[PDB]
Design a protein around this ligand. Structure first.
Ligand SMILES: Nc1ncnc2c1ncn2[C@@H]1O[C@H](COP(=O)(O)OP(=O)(O)OP(=O)(O)O)[C@@H](O)[C@H]1O
Ligand SMILES: [Mg+2]
Length: 503
């Protein structure tokens, strides 16, 4: 009855020699082998000063060794803290100072620089490279495989993941053993994962999607995964003939749609395509079904909440919607201010509650308090509505709402109109200060190479479909939209870039 995620996963292992992970080089690792690797690394953590509750901060390229470090940290009663591989030394200083890890694991090439930061909190530094080699690996080579998995309670911490930083400086979400186990166990059943599943895993593992959703679901299900270092369209297509599931972000799908190899035949062996982490556009959903005959299953989650909602595996998968609340999870829509729940169909603030919901922000009890309602619901900061069937629809982030001339203007329906115009790839509608209207609705648009469509053409096209107060005051064409490492459009960046256009 140990609640320790590692114990939930592996204490009882009925089929130990079954495949768990195939590496990018084609090496194969069984469940028993994975467990033994984690035992060695857990012993290394203790030998390097880990005490129960200590954080282990890890910035490494993706590898099975890096995944093992996650498992071992949890197993040893530590708190795993993955960090975006792109963070610079200076950025890392903030996270290391905030979290005060006892151990920091980094790429061999950064050891000297990171050691300086680590010394500020007295952390021990080990290394792990893209090839799975380094001081961590040397230490594990002589360590014992046997390790008594540490007793942990449901609410004890297993991890701290920093948010993606879309709306400001990343905050450290404190995730418990039960947060992670309850969510992944629910998903195994809800998505019907079985030991026969083979998951193509091409996502980063410093983010909740690639780290927890991909790994924990597979591992609980006793299925396996195939690692790829990053999104590679041709390698992903190659693997579909011998895999059953792909978890991706919308950019995976729009990029795969550009391959002439993406056909019914090429995807015919696959069971399920899942999309998450950013909005899957309804047009993208329809394009995928038109080209491949598969209905993409989209789900919605956050760093702070793990997965909240999902389109059903055995029900209607609705373009533009993220599905009803998962089993065990409650979702509602409230008046953003007052907090009163709204009638089904009304747009407002999405709030969630459940065993998936985190314990708060690391050493930010005040900001934690402001993000929870009195009755324990968490304010997502996402605006949307819940339809008559209980499907949640996300309209945008609260900060993406544009208030202009006294009106609430929701950008997505404008973007949908612009996207539908011939010559348009995609568009982002934002608001920036305007002296006459409060904010000026501004359309930032990516067009096809050689497309003729221009500003006047775009505004005229909208004129006959859109209320006057919703009309963009100008259209700005760009080579591409700014996106973070997980493929999300950064409207924060756009608002900053164009803040002065109406000055
Ligand atoms: N399927 C989806 N459809 C629409 N939006 C989504 C979906 N999945 C995730 N999102 C958006 O991503 C957010 C979760 O992102 P994440 O936890 O990676 O950090 P972030 O919110 O982007 O960064 P920060 O919290 O630092 O501002 C959600 O709150 C939601 O706005
Ligand atoms: Mg957020």
């Amino acid at each position: 009855m140990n609640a320790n995620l590692f114990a939930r996963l592996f204490d009882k292992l009925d089929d130990p020699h079954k495949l768990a992970i195939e590496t990018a080089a084609g090496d194969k690792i069984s469940y028993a082998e994975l467990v033994a690797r984690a035992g060695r690394v857990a012993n290394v953590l203790v030998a390097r000063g880990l005490q129960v509750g200590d954080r282990v901060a890890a910035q490494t390229e993706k590898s099975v060794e890096a995944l093992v470090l996650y498992l071992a940290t949890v197993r040893a009663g530590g708190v795993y803290l993955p960090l975006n591989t792109a963070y610079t030394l200076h950025e890392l200083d903030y996270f290391i100072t905030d979290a005060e890890p006892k151990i920091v694991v980094c790429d061999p090439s950064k050891r000297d620089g990171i050691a300086a930061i680590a010394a500020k909190v007295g952390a021990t530094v080990e290394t792990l490279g893209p090839d799975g080699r380094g001081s961590l690996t040397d230490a594990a080579a002589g360590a014992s495989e046997a390790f008594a998995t540490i007793d942990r309670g449901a609410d004890d911490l297993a991890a701290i993941l920093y948010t993606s930083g879309t709306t400001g400086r990343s905050k450290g979400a404190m995730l418990s053993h039960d947060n992670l186990a309850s969510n992944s166990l629910t998903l195994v059943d809800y998505w019907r994962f079985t030991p026969d599943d083979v998951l193509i895993h091409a996502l980063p593992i410093y983010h909740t999607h690639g780290l927890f959703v991909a790994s924990n679901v597979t591992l609980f299900a006793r299925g396996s995964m195939i690692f790829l270092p990053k999104f590679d369209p041709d390698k992903i297509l190659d693997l579909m003939a011998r895999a059953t599931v792909l978890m991706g972000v919308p950019t995976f799908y729009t990029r795969l749609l550009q391959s002439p190899r993406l056909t019914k035949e090429t995807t015919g062996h696959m069971r399920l395509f899942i999309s998450g982490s950013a909005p899957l556009l309804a047009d993208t959903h329809r394009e995928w079904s038109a080209k491949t005959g598969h209905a993409v299953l989209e789900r919605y989650g956050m760093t702070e909440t793990n997965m909240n909602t999902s389109n059903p595996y055995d029900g209607d998968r609705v373009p533009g919607a993220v599905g009803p609340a998962l089993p065990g999870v409650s979702a509602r829509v409230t008046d953003p201010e007052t907090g009163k729940e709204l009638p089904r169909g009304d747009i407002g603030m999405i709030e969630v509650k459940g065993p998936n919901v985190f314990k708060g922000y690391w050493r930010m009890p005040e900001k934690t308090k402001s993000e929870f309602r009195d009755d324990g619901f968490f304010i997502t900061g996402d605006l949307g509505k819940i339809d008559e069937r209980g499907y949640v629809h996300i309209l945008g982030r609260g900060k993406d709402l544009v208030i202009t001339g006294g009106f609430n203007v929701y950008p997505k329906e404008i973007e949908s109109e612009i996207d539908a115009m011939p010559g348009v790839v995609e568009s982002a509608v934002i608001g920036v200060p305007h002296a006459d209207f409060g904010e000026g609705v501004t359309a930032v648009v990516v067009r096809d190479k050689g497309a003729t469509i221009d500003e006047a053409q775009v505004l005229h096209g909208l004129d006959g479909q859109l209320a006057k107060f919703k009309m963009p005051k100008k259209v700005i064409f760009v080579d591409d939209l700014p996106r973070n490492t997980m493929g999300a459009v950064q409207k924060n960046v756009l608002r900053e870039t164009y803040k002065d256009i109406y000055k």
